[PDB]
């Protein structure tokens, strides 16, 4: 009855942690922020429509110059757009068209993508030859690639349906650190601003904070009732929201190790596919299966605005590093730039 | 205005034309999703249509270029990736007829044939596949003839009251699978009794695909 004694001991440890969290919940952020003024009329307009994809868009990523962005679609194309002019800078043909994620290196020298091929492909954007070339195919995951984010030109973190995350050395192509402990498909990850930590969201309805260099889970955050599809760090690195199938966004503070706020409306019942913060953190933007993007007041939980410009699922979105614009990508094959 | 952006705008149009021309090829593609429990006969069909996640194969027949995707090894929740295959022309669902009498494993909940029905129920009724034609390859008919001589169908279907002839058992099994379709008026199942030696099955999928194209063209041309 060793398995019996352990299964009961885990319940006591869970109860201890629950009690410790309750002990420091002397108030809620909502009552703390009652005094501050609401943001009011958020009237965002479409300034650009990026046309040229011929299938559903599943991912995009802004470059660090806040001008270039990459998009990935099931038409087998990775397109880099100049968002100021709408010019297509590159059109990269993918060996496998079943992509689910893409990423832009902070240096701008590389893009990444992957999906149901279980491979994260690295693409060199700055070749002497003049075209884009696959520089590395990172193989070793046993489920689909759901997300990836560069740490730098030589390191990238991936998430996979195999329930693990991995840190890769791009030069050698080897998994140098693995991140195990999730019990369901990992759908999304978000890098801390200092790149020392990242958080992951999984189909076990939990989020986990991982220490990159030590390779283990520091904290585990529960509260969601269904799939976590999306996750994003607060700009100061001390919190992160979690888009979920439960039509909710539950901001979790790291240092207080618990939920601070939920963002939901009684008339919103669809899943959330993507989340991102504005530059100051005041606005939480989230993309919904109901074809809309909702803009939440992150401090007061009131909805501030709506972006309704797509004819199909919003599958991805992102805010520029300078905060000047948000891009939304959609199953309807278009991207739109808003500010 | 547009000093050196003129060559950039020109480059954007030159690669925007190649996107259009690459989508014209893809628009002629027949996309096939191969499904089925392990050992149902999927790899035999793959060999028949011929000479790391999504294994892919392509072939030409009667001037139609087919592209078939075998989900294969994909250890994950289907609900998170199945929507990627919205828009495939047809699903080919392979069912092992001879699996009906397979003994339960050590901790197996149900027998192999009923697991196939559960997969078929989930796929046929999936919200992403409402308007997708399902082609059913009932394979290993040769082995079925040997097994049915000595092993009664009641092992698989306790409610079955017919005889253990091929004709009665095959018709009943086909009916049991086709009855799972809750959207018969909007979705059509194309059932074939293929085997390891059958060669008209590739012709069968071509005929079934041609009907699907008619439905798509009638929908596009406004007649549907």
């Amino acid at each position, epitope marked *: 009855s060793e398995l019996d004694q352990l299964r009961q001991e885990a319940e006591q440890l869970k109860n201890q942690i629950r009690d410790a969290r309750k002990a420091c919940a002397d108030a809620t952020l909502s009552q703390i922020t009652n005094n501050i003024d609401p943001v009011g009329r958020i009237q965002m307009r479409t300034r650009r429509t990026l046309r040229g994809h011929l299938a559903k868009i599943y991912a995009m990523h802004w470059g660090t110059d806040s*001008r*270039l962005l990459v998009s990935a679609s099931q038409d087998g194309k990775l397109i880099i757009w*100049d968002s100021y*002019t709408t*010019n297509k*800078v*590159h059109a990269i043909p993918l060996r496998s068209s079943w992509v689910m994620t893409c990423a832009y290196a902070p240096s*701008g020298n590389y893009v990444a993508c992957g999906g149901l091929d279980n491979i994260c492909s690295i693409y060199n954007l700055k070749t*002497r*030859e*003049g*075209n884009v070339r696959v520089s590395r195919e990172l193989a070793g995951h046993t489920g689909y690639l759901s997300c990836c984010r560069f740490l730098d030109d030589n390191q990238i973190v991936t998430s996979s349906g195999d329930t693990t995350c991995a840190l890769w050395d791009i030069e050698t192509g080897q998994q140098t650190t693995t991140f195990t402990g999730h019990t369901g498909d990992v759908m999304s990850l978000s890098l801390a601003p200092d790149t020392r930590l990242f958080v992951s969201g999984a189909c076990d309805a939990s989020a986990k904070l991982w220490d990159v260099r030590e390779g283990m889970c520091r904290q585990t955050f529960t509260g969601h009732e269904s799939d976590i599809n999306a996750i994003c760090f607060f700009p100061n690195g001390n919190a992160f929201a979690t888009g979920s199938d439960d039509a909710t966004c539950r901001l979790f503070d790291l240092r207080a190790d618990q939920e601070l706020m939920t963002y939901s409306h009684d008339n919103i019942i669809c899943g959330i596919t993507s989340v991102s913060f504005s530059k100051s953190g005041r606005l939480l933007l989230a993309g919904y299966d109901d074809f809309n993007c909702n803009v939440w007041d992150a401090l007061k939980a009131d909805r501030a605005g709506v972006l309704a410009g797509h004819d199909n699922r919003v599958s991805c979105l992102g805010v520029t590093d300078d905060g000047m614009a948000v891009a939304t990508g959609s199953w309807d094959s278009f991207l739109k730039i808003w500010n | *205005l547009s*000093a*050196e*952006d*003129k*060559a*950039a705008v*020109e*480059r954007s149009k*030159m690669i925007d034309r190649n996107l259009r021309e690459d989508g014209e090829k893809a628009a002629k593609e027949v996309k096939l999703l191969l499904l089925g429990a392990g050992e149902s006969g999927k790899s035999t069909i793959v060999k028949q249509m011929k000479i790391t996640g999504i294994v892919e194969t392509h072939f030409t027949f009667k001037d139609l270029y087919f592209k078939m995707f075998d989900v294969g090894g994909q250890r994950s929740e289907r609900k998170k990736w199945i929507h990627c295959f919205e828009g495939v022309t047809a699903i080919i669902f392979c069912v092992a007829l001879s699996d009906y009498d397979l003994v339960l494993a050590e901790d197996e909940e149900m027998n192999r044939m009923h697991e196939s029905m559960k997969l078929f129920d989930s796929i046929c009724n999936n919200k992403w596949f409402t308007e997708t034609s399902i082609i059913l390859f009932l394979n290993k008919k040769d082995l079925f003839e040997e097994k049915i001589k000595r092993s009664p169908l009641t092992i698989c279907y306790p409610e079955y009251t017919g005889s253990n002839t091929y004709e009665e058992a095959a018709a009943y099994i086909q009916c049991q699978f086709e009855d799972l379709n809750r959207r018969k008026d909007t979705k059509e199942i194309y059932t074939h009794f293929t085997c390891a030696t059958d060669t008209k099955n590739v012709q069968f999928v071509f005929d079934a695909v041609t009907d699907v194209i008619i439905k798509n063209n009638l929908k596009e041309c406004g007649l549907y």
Partner: single-chain antibody
Amino acid sequence: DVQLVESGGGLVQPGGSRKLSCSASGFAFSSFGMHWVRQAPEKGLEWVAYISSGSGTIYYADTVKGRFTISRDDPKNTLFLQMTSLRSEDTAMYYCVRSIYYYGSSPFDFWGQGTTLTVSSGSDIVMTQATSSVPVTPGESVSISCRSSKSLLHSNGNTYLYWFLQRPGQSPQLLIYRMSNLASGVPDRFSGSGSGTAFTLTISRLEAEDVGVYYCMQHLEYPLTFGAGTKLELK
């Protein structure tokens, strides 16, 4: 390994015709806007013709329009210049130059080896390098200057000024594109600055191999025009 190898040069009588070729290897030739630039024996660089990737756009210099025809054969990775009514003033070394144009690209980043042609016996932007030569010693710091008759700063924010270096006996090499950007493979001891009309290329701790002729060039509008060049002599 990027290669551009010109051929077809030689001695020709005035009024005759001659076809130059440029053979490309080691890169994606098709997606590169080619450029013919020529250099008279004891003179500077002069832009001759441009054909874009896809051949959709062709520009000629005034002194050659009507007489010269530029073309490319993409399947065989070859560039052509069909010349007719050749005059004595056409005697020059002809360089084939590749140039790809997109956001953040580096145009004019590779020049061919050159082929020698010998012929027997206004609105254009003027580029000015008032200093024709400069004596230098290793380790010292130099500043070469260039000026334009029109502002090179565009409403998009870019200033379309390029710096090239021609070492003795070799083809010109890109150093700076759009006034401040360091070309790939160029040591960080070069730097460029300026504003609108006046521009400066600065070298820190100049070495031995740095000696040569430095040309500025505007890419604001066609025809592209070069400065007369500034030579760096050893003391």
